[PDB]
């Protein structure tokens, strides 16, 4: 489908509530494999298992290795914009 931009609100004591797989070294996007119930990703209601995370807060993750992408994602705070597309 189309690119969507979705806002997630994460409190400082919370994680994002996603499992992510993929990355440049695998020739696939950064992908959401699980959405954990009640955590910020679930609450925003705009993200699905199978979504590729193209960018977070304007950080392009289309050509980044797994670990680096996870690091960038885990550094995000507050109101976080995900640019996603369903694969």
């Amino acid at each position: 489908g189309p690119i969507r931009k979705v806002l997630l609100l994460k409190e400082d004591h919370e994680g994002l509530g996603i499992s992510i797989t993929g990355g440049k070294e695998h020739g696939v996007p950064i992908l959401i494999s699980e959405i954990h119930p009640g955590q910020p990703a679930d609450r925003c209601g705009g993200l699905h298992v199978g979504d590729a995370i193209l960018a977070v807060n304007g950080v392009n993750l289309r050509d980044t290795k797994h670990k680096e992408a996870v690091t960038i994602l885990s550094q995000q705070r507050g109101e976080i914009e995900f640019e996603v597309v369903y694969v």
Binding site: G15, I20, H26, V28, E34, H36, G50
Partner: peptide
């Protein structure tokens, strides 16, 4: 539907 490379068993992180 079907076979997407992005569905294959790959290293995963929980965040």
């Amino acid at each position: 539907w079907x076979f997407k490379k992005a569905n294959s068993r790959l290293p995963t992180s929980i965040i």
